Design a protein around this ligand. Sequence first.
Ligand SMILES: Nc1nc2c(ncn2[C@@H]2O[C@H](COP(=O)(O)OP(=O)(O)O)[C@@H](O)[C@H]2O)c(=O)[nH]1
Lengths: 420, 56
Amino acid sequence: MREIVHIQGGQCGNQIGAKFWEVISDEHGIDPTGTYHNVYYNEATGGRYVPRAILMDLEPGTMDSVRAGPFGQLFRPDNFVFGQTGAGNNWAKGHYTEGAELIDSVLDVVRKEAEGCDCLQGFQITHSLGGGTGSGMGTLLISKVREEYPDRIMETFSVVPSPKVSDTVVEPYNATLSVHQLVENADECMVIDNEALYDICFRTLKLTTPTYGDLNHLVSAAMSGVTCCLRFPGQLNSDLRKLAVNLIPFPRLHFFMIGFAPLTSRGSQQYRALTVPELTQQMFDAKNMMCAADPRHGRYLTASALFRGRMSTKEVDEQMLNVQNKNSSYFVEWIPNNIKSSICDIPPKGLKMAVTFVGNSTAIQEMFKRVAEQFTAMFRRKAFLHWYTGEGMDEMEFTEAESNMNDLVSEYQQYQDATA
Amino acid sequence: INMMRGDLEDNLNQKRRNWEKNTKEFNIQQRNEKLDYERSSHLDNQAQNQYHITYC
Ligand SMILES: Nc1nc2c(ncn2[C@@H]2O[C@H](COP(=O)(O)OP(=O)(O)O)[C@@H](O)[C@H]2O)c(=O)[nH]1
């Protein structure tokens, strides 16, 4: 009855998954041993609960990572598949030679996991787009599972490479090669980039030393809020599919933007009484979203907002109307009433009000534009290309991937500029 | 018979006014219960706001 498996991949995807599982355990009142104090968890002998997630990676370091952190004993060893080498920041080493011999096995651990459910609402993936392991394996797996279960939807909670603050030197190749395939067999590519996460955690919470734990926790909160209106009753309920129907007008404009609310520090926490219009002003601000792309620089094709807690639905709908009507320029004309709302009934742990905003908006083609810029700059000289062409990859697939990327961005531009 | 008809209509009108005053009793009780409602909800709102903000 509308269950969700949680496939992971790569080190970043694995850390995000561990954080998300422990946050969900916090919301659903579970302890790090799996005892109470069906959509996500599964029942197990002795009243125990085990998450319905698989954990794949080539390097066994992330194994000890998800063991060390709390709530690591919730998972089951049958879902700990792990290689030995680690693609070491090489895309093809997780898509053709070394990654392949794992995906097969992973298929097994999916096929004796999906059929475990009875009415599966779809999958969801958590991985990176630059790291070879995560990107490559997740792309191959998206391929296989879309070949297997085409009827269900597969959200991809992807973290695109940090555009300007790069930590590796082979991001563009991996990102382009992966997006070329993700645009085909994916349905909800919600992009995240550490630039925006540091921006938020600096200029909205004044925190001292932001480690990856805090960014993972924030993305966890957003991930939970995305489907909590499904997990719980509400005055106006939604799901993983109503979002898709109300968010994409064409089978390939499905790349989203994520935003969470509210977020303040103790100083600002003392002030600013909590009320729905303040939440709207916080969610529809530019820099308050998980993507380093000022949304004013594009138009919102469409945008949904899920509220959590108790409120007055008239206030919600009236604020939505006021905000889509006053700033008519930043919104798109040829589609009317392009905003969407939904309301749950159980807010998070001690948070009287919570908003999760998901928006399909043509203001995110700039990210792909600049990533493809870096790519085509590093490809005209065939730089760092032997590492790939030595592993069966040719040099035509790169041109195909870049041309598909440019076709996607051209689609965004073309059907943004359209009129009625 | 004229006197009897006059008396009966007088009693009927008295019953009318009596039911009207009953309904007014009910309306005033309604208004005051609504004010009780709004003040209690305001205090509950302050309580939930303290609970959410002191949540460090
Ligand atoms: N929010 C977050 N971002 C990460 C994390 N690890 C890596 N990133 C970024 O994601 C990119 C590389 O991803 P990585 O997981 O190291 O590649 P993999 O080894 O193939 O899985 C780099 O831009 C990293 O900076 C993490 O744990 N949390």
